[PDB]
């Protein structure tokens, strides 16, 4: 029993319908009792999977009625009749018909929303860190949509490369945005050799790239 799902992902607007497909490589309809041994789970980042549906079509207690399941013993669907912001997650099907119990690979669900420009912030290194010999400069892109964004570091207007790392959040369960953190890391010696520290942000919501900057040792 190999479980497959389709599509691998989807992004649709709030209030739209979403159906997720799942197939088992043999039947999980039990002839003896005419039950389908098929469950669906919802999983958000950092959390365990959460049981939504079992017996292919029975909604688990406490689950919103916009979730429903249906199926044919080998082909199954999970439907969200009206997508809500908190539904962003990965959805897994799973057969419990025959050992080993097996899971599908998951279908990732994201919300497509209107364009939202990032709020761009910058943080100089702390004096505490600088005493340790290292300087980390943080550039923050808060609550933007879509996820695609580009950060460039400029130090005294010279474009940087090779000394930063960034990561993006999962999609926000309330406003369907993303946030991004980028850290430029230099030695204290290198940091103190320059004045202007800037991150430059390009995003679909910005008519021209936004630059956020500070002068080291100035206030």
Partner 1 sequence: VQLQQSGPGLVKPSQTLSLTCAISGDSVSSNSAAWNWIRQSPSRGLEWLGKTYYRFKWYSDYAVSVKGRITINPDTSKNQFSLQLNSVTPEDTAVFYCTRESTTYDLLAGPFDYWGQGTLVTVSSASTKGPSVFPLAPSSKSTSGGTAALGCLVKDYFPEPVTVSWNSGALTSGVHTFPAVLQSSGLYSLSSVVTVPSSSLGTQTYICNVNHKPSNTKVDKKVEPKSCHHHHHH
Distance CA 117, CA 143 (A): 8
The answer to the question of residue 85 lying near partner 1 (CB under 8 A) is no
Distance CA 202, CA 178 (A): 15
The answer to the question of residue 21 lying near partner 1 (CB under 8 A) is no
The answer to the question of residue 126 lying near partner 1 (CB under 8 A) is yes
The answer to the question of residue 24 lying near partner 1 (CB under 8 A) is no
Q: What are phi and psi of 82, to 5 degrees?
A: -155, 105
Distance CA 199, CA 219 (A): 19
Are 90 and 108 within 8 A, CB to CB? yes
Per CB under 8 A, the segment of 14-22, 79-87, 133-141, 148-156 that binds partner 1 is 133-141
Which spans in the chain are helix H?
Answer: 127-131, 188-191
- Listed in sequence order, the residues at least 6 apart from 1 whose beta carbon sits closer than 8 Å to its beta carbon are 24, 25, 26, 28, 95, 97, 98, 102
Q: How many residues bind partner 1 (CB under 8 A)?
A: 53
What would the x/- binding string for partner 1 be over residues 51 to 80, using CB under 8 A? Answer: x--x-----x--------------------
Per CB under 8 A, the segment of 43-51, 80-88, 149-157, 202-210 that binds partner 1 is 43-51
Pairing of strands 107-112, 9-13: parallel
Q: Which is nearer to partner 1, 17 or 209 (by Cβ)? A: 209
Query: In the set 59, 89, 106, 184, which binds partner 1 (CB under 8 A)?
Result: 106
Query: In the set 129, 152, 160, 211, which binds partner 1 (CB under 8 A)?
Result: 129
Are 51 and 89 within 8 A, CB to CB? no
Which residues lie near partner 1 (CB under 8 A)?
33, 37, 39, 41, 46-51, 54, 60, 92, 94, 96-97, 99-106, 119, 121-129, 132, 136, 138, 140, 142, 165-169, 179, 181, 183, 212-214, 217-219
């Amino acid at each position: 029993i190999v479980m497959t799902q389709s599509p691998d992902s989807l992004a649709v607007s709030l209030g739209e319908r979403a159906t997720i497909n799942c197939k088992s490589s043999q039947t999980v309809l039990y002839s003896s009792n005419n039950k389908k041994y098929l469950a669906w789970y919802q999983q958000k980042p950092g959390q365990p999977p959460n049981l939504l549906i079992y017996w292919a079509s029975t909604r688990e207690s406490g689950v919103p009625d916009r979730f429903s399941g249906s199926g044919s013993g080998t082909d199954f669907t999970l439907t969200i009749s009206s997508l809500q912001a908190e539904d962003v997650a990965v959805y897994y099907c799973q057969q419990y018909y025959s050992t080993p119990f097996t899971f599908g690979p998951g279908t990732k669900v994201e919300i497509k929303r209107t364009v939202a420009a990032p709020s761009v912030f910058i943080f100089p290194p702390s004096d505490e860190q600088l005493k340790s010999g290292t300087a980390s400069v943080v550039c923050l892109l808060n609550n933007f949509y879509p996820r695609e964004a580009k950060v460039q570091w400029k130090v005294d207007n010279a474009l940087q490369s090779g000394n930063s790392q960034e990561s993006v959040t999962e999609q926000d369960s309330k406003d369907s945005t993303y946030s991004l953190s980028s850290t430029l890391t230099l030695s204290k010696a290198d940091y103190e050799k320059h004045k202007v520290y800037a991150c430059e942000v390009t995003h679909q919501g910005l008519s021209s790239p936004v630059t956020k900057s500070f002068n080291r040792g100035e206030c």
